[PDB]
Amino acid sequence: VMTDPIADMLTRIRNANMVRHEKLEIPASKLKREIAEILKREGFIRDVEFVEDSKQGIIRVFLKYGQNNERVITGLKRISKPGLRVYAKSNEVPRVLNGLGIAIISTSQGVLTDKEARAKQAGGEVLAYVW
Amino acid sequence: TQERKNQLINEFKTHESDTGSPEVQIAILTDSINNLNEHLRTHKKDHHSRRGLLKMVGKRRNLLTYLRNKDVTRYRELINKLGLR
Amino acid sequence: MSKTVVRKNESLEDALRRFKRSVSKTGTLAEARKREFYEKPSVKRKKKSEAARKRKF
Amino acid sequence: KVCYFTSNGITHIDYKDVDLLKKFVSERGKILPRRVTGTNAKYQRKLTAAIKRARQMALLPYVS
Amino acid sequence: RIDPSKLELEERLVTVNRVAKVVKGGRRFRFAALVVVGDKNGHVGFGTGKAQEVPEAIRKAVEDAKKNLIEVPMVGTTIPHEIIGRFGAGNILLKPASEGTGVIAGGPVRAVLELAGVADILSKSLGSNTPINMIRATLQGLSELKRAEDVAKLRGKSVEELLG
Amino acid sequence: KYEVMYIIRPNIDEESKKAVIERFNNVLTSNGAEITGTKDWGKRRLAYEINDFRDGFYQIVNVQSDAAAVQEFDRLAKISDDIIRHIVVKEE
RNA sequence: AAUAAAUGAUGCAGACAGUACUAGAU
RNA sequence: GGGGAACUUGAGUGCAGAAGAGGAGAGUGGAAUUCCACGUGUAGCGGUGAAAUGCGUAGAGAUGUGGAGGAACACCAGUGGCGAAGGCGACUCUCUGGUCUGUAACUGACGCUGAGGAGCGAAAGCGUGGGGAGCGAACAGGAUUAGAUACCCUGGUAGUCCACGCCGUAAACGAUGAGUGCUAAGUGUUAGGGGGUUUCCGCCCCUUAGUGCUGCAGCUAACGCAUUAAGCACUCCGCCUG
């Protein structure tokens, strides 16, 4: 069942951050790979790798702690839940903490962040926030 | 036991090793429900067996709905073969 | 009652010494002494889990 | 302590074993506890079954 | 790190609650003092004190607050981003405001924000109105704030890369 | 598989005991219950007293039937005075 | 020739007010 | 989201095993209580804080034998086990439900929840016909108290039991809805599996589902919870607004 893979992915990442872990294993769907690569290019993660196996495929995430003891991903939160979908327009694209954070948004042309969607003049599902 | 199942399997086997066979599971559930009602017609107070029969019937109904949504031809064939009316 | 085993060539209290010790391994002190007044099934069941574990007896 | 059935690798008690049932039952007739006999839970349950069947078949007493 | 108390401070009390202890003889009354000490350059702290006298309790609370100072970002005389504190059933949100809005908050939160040097903040309490918990939640929310340059250094990016 | 053990009253001659044994065996075979095994412990002292005797003859029989000759044997032993106690168990 | 530590179940005690009562300031 | 085509991890079938107070039905059992009959046998028996009501010289209690009948199943027995919940504890048998272990052979999303509805549903209670050993509301008597329509004692109806039907309520509680995923540890325990020497007995490690205690982070008003959450998240249902 599980009703959604993305929310559980985000919560697993949040628990990993809370415990100060260094690795994770996820069934690694296409959208999950996309979000992980976005976080990678955003500096939230040290490195990410894909493991295409026979069962479904697996992805490993390496949490980032650039300094002595600091959680890069302080918190996460999903919005477009399965039962209350959220769609934001180009003019209503939000910004996380005055542009300090980042929010993932699937748009008409690929999956992009808030700033990328604002630049490209698009909009769609606001499926997650990041702080 | 170990005879009715084997016969139903050999009868409803579409392939050499087809044992998932929603039709086979339906036939097995039907024969089990019949054997259960046989004794429930006398031990009317065994409510736990009635709950088990309700569970089996729910499984049967879900399988029948799946088969109807998947292949109406095979659904109607199973109907004509078993008489599950 | 301790047992049917007989002992002789001792004192009067030497027999009671072993009586009071061997009577422990028989229901004469528990089975025949608890059922003087009724105990509800709930408390009846909880009494075992309490005594046989806490080792109060 | 050490269990008997495990040490012997034996199978179903075969209640006919009157001597075994006797030496495993108290001198009075009451069933000895597991903490004293050293047996496992499964073997203790089988022991209870066997001793009950024996008492039913006059192979062991009820009162002594 | 711990901030040194060697600075000019505008120590200002909030409330003085009178508590009583019951004894064979009767009730023994003591005074509890809440005080907020800080400067208007981004450093503030909270302390408390108890004694049978008002001035002694005030002095003890001031001395304790001196040892519990904390730093707060002052991006544009305001906070870099909104945040909420949730210390002990006390929920208080803090939003950044323009240059002419002013400090808007209930007594204790307003005092804490003023003594910290912030002039334009939007606040709203959404929980208990107890002053201790109010101050604690405000302090927690201010501690959980992050600077733009700090976040840029942490995420291995440039300030402009984040602000645009 | 099934097992059957019963007790015969002691005050019975050898010929009468054998006749009773054959009678009950025929009763069991009324449906075709093959007798896969037999054992006679003999004279054993009962742990406790019964109707009129302290000892008796123990008889063991292995059977593989359809649970009908079992009921026949049961109702016959409960009625007949030759047998005192009896129990049927599955050898599974 | 020696020599044992026990045993325990206590009967009775109902009510008390309507209105009353201490503070403290950088 | 709809339609089309593939996949197994979800889901289910089979394969070889495992435990269990799982249920309905039939038979059996020996302790123990009561009564009856008889042999021995006298002045008491039973009971309370004390006492009395009660039974006993038409021969009690006790002791020994036999019979009659009815309920429950000592020791095993252990936060042990099963069941969706209530609940389930002697033995034998007929008919039956679910669960766990390696599943990989099989179908390949067939899954979760579920208003309304149906069914089940402690004890008590009601109706029909039986049965009634002990216990025992109501009731009678004897005590205490100022009073006792009670707490104590002696008797004692219905009830407790059996077949059918009805009622559908409990502190029916873990005062914690169902499903899934993630989140340090030590620790016993039930039924299994694999292994590192041993044929073993047994020691250790690993791995499944369940049952218990102490405890990190985290949560919480605190109490406390903490891989069986009251932690971190998603889906559905019922409920709350002095």
Side-chain angles (χ1 to χ4, degrees):
Chain A
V1 187
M2 174 193 199
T3 60
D4 46 347
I6 300 163
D8 267 316
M9 202 201 83
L10 296 160
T11 63
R12 201 176 303 185
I13 291 163
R14 197 191 312 100
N15 288 331
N17 293 277
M18 290 293 104
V19 180
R20 275 148 181 163
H21 269 178
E22 316 302 286
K23 300 182 300 313
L24 287 177
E25 304 286 21
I26 313 174
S29 76
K30 200 170 192 178
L31 204 147
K32 289 191 197 192
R33 294 181 186 172
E34 181 55 62
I35 286 170
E37 287 290 357
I38 289 163
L39 286 161
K40 172 67 187 95
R41 69 188 81 169
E42 267 285 10
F44 285 102
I45 307 169
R46 288 171 182 173
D47 44 274
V48 58
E49 58 190 6
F50 317 90
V51 189
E52 282 68 5
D53 65 355
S54 159
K55 178 271 217 187
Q56 183 44 231
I58 295 165
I59 185 175
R60 279 208 278 286
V61 185
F62 292 79
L63 276 63
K64 180 179 174 181
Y65 313 110
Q67 283 73 11
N68 304 118
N69 193 2
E70 297 84 355
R71 295 189 170 80
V72 173
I73 297 92
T74 64
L76 299 172
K77 180 178 178 58
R78 177 171 196 186
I79 293 159
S80 74
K81 290 180 286 301
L84 175 60
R85 297 290 189 181
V86 166
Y87 306 97
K89 288 191 168 188
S90 58
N91 195 16
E92 286 69 2
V93 171
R95 43 169 52 187
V96 187
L97 312 185
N98 306 336
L100 195 66
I102 203 83
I104 313 313
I105 318 180
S106 65
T107 70
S108 41
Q109 40 191 308
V111 173
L112 321 163
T113 66
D114 55 286
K115 298 172 186 178
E116 292 171 270
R118 199 82 61 79
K120 281 177 59 163
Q121 192 77 23
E125 296 249 22
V126 183
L127 51 84
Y129 274 6
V130 184
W131 305 299
Chain B
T1 313
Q2 304 298 129
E3 297 69 68
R4 61 184 194 273
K5 281 205 294 177
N6 301 146
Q7 292 137 359
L8 294 171
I9 292 156
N10 304 132
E11 200 275 354
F12 291 99
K13 245 187 174 180
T14 64
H15 303 347
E16 67 283 5
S17 62
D18 208 357
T19 55
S21 294
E23 61 279 5
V24 170
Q25 193 171 345
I26 285 166
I28 295 161
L29 290 171
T30 49
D31 80 9
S32 181
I33 287 164
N34 298 336
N35 297 347
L36 206 156
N37 199 20
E38 279 179 33
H39 95 81
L40 261 176
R41 299 227 182 181
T42 48
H43 309 87
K44 306 166 185 172
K45 295 180 182 297
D46 187 2
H47 296 304
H48 305 253
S49 63
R50 273 202 170 83
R51 182 178 191 283
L53 197 157
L54 287 166
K55 279 283 200 174
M56 290 207 286
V57 161
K59 289 182 176 181
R60 203 174 72 178
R61 191 56 41 189
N62 287 335
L63 286 159
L64 289 163
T65 53
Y66 168 79
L67 191 68
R68 189 191 300 101
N69 295 321
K70 195 188 199 301
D71 41 338
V72 178
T73 61
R74 209 191 305 178
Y75 171 74
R76 180 180 300 153
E77 288 294 339
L78 174 150
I79 277 164
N80 294 316
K81 287 171 178 173
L82 286 176
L84 206 165
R85 314 270 51 73
Chain C
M1 300 312 295
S2 160
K3 212 46 169 184
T4 175
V5 186
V6 176
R7 294 165 53 272
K8 249 60 155 173
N9 189 7
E10 62 264 8
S11 87
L12 75 169
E13 221 286 296
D14 188 348
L16 280 293
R17 282 176 64 194
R18 55 89 178 167
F19 264 109
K20 59 203 290 292
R21 295 183 65 80
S22 45
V23 293
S24 45
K25 312 182 312 307
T26 58
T28 53
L29 311 164
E31 182 39 58
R33 302 198 177 191
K34 285 185 322 303
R35 290 174 172 186
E36 306 180 320
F37 296 90
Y38 184 58
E39 59 188 301
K40 262 140 82 147
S42 44
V43 58
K44 192 165 206 324
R45 176 219 56 248
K46 194 176 181 177
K47 219 73 184 180
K48 291 186 70 174
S49 183
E50 284 184 42
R53 291 179 48 203
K54 299 164 179 292
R55 190 150 294 283
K56 298 205 296 178
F57 288 74
Chain D
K1 71 203 82 69
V2 180
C3 171
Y4 183 91
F5 287 69
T6 64
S7 69
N8 297 114
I10 188 56
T11 194
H12 51 57
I13 297 168
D14 187 327
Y15 55 95
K16 307 301 298 197
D17 197 338
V18 307
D19 54 69
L20 178 145
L21 270 43
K22 282 159 145 46
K23 80 182 199 299
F24 274 25
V25 165
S26 66
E27 293 177 350
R28 199 228 65 80
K30 273 190 163 182
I31 294 164
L32 284 163
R34 187 186 172 185
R35 78 185 192 275
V36 170
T37 319
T39 64
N40 305 323
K42 186 162 68 193
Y43 299 147
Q44 187 65 75
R45 296 193 218 96
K46 292 189 174 183
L47 255 70
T48 47
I51 183 51
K52 289 176 183 176
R53 291 183 177 182
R55 291 169 170 174
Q56 194 61 229
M57 281 296 220
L59 310 188
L60 264 160
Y62 282 88
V63 184
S64 59
Chain E
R1 308 307 78 78
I2 190 74
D3 296 327
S5 61
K6 174 60 78 186
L7 290 174
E8 197 284 337
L9 302 161
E10 311 187 16
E11 68 195 32
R12 147 173 167 188
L13 84 173
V14 167
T15 45
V16 177
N17 181 15
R18 195 268 303 288
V19 297
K21 204 259 193 167
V22 189
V23 195
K24 151 63 79 171
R27 306 168 191 169
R28 319 302 193 191
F29 297 108
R30 296 185 298 176
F31 299 105
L34 274 65
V35 183
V36 181
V37 182
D39 75 335
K40 290 183 169 183
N41 306 276
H43 278 77
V44 68
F46 171 53
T48 56
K50 299 171 67 170
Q52 295 172 322
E53 305 177 27
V54 179
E56 309 302 338
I58 294 161
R59 293 164 171 177
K60 290 199 186 189
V62 165
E63 294 166 359
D64 302 358
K66 280 177 179 181
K67 311 175 185 177
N68 213 28
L69 291 180
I70 197 171
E71 176 271 356
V72 63
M74 293 298 304
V75 178
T77 67
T78 65
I79 54 172
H81 76 109
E82 59 268 29
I83 198 157
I84 314 94
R86 297 208 70 261
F87 189 105
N91 290 349
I92 299 167
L93 57 89
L94 308 166
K95 267 185 173 183
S98 65
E99 299 182 353
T101 67
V103 302
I104 300 168
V109 183
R110 183 188 183 82
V112 167
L113 289 174
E114 290 171 342
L115 298 169
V118 202
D120 307 322
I121 287 289
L122 289 164
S123 76
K124 178 61 173 181
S125 56
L126 314 171
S128 62
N129 296 320
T130 56
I132 305 171
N133 314 132
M134 282 271 219
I135 297 160
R136 301 263 195 179
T138 49
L139 194 150
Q140 191 71 8
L142 297 173
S143 310
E144 278 133 3
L145 281 168
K146 295 92 182 181
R147 288 175 169 278
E149 303 174 358
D150 190 2
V151 170
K153 162 176 67 58
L154 169 145
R155 293 206 280 123
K157 281 189 168 186
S158 194
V159 180
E160 58 268 48
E161 191 180 7
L162 313 194
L163 274 72
Chain F
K1 300 185 180 184
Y2 296 75
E3 179 177 20
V4 187
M5 209 273 271
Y6 63 94
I7 302 172
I8 304 163
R9 58 188 299 275
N11 302 328
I12 281 181
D13 313 278
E14 62 88 10
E15 53 80 19
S16 33
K17 183 177 174 187
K18 186 183 291 303
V20 169
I21 291 160
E22 302 320 320
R23 185 213 322 281
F24 276 94
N25 296 324
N26 300 318
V27 164
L28 291 171
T29 60
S30 60
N31 59 3
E34 289 98 58
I35 296 161
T36 62
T38 300
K39 174 61 179 62
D40 172 69
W41 277 77
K43 205 81 176 190
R44 284 198 284 181
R45 175 60 64 85
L46 306 167
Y48 57 83
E49 275 63 4
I50 329 183
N51 307 72
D52 188 275
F53 322 107
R54 268 89 168 193
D55 48 0
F57 310 121
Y58 283 80
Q59 294 291 157
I60 295 160
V61 183
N62 293 327
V63 177
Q64 306 191 2
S65 88
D66 314 328
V70 170
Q71 302 168 33
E72 297 197 348
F73 189 102
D74 293 327
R75 69 165 182 270
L76 263 288
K78 290 220 293 299
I79 292 165
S80 67
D81 63 68
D82 312 278
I83 298 179
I84 288 164
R85 198 80 80 203
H86 76 269
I87 284 103
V88 301
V89 186
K90 259 170 162 165
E91 296 184 328
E92 307 192 86

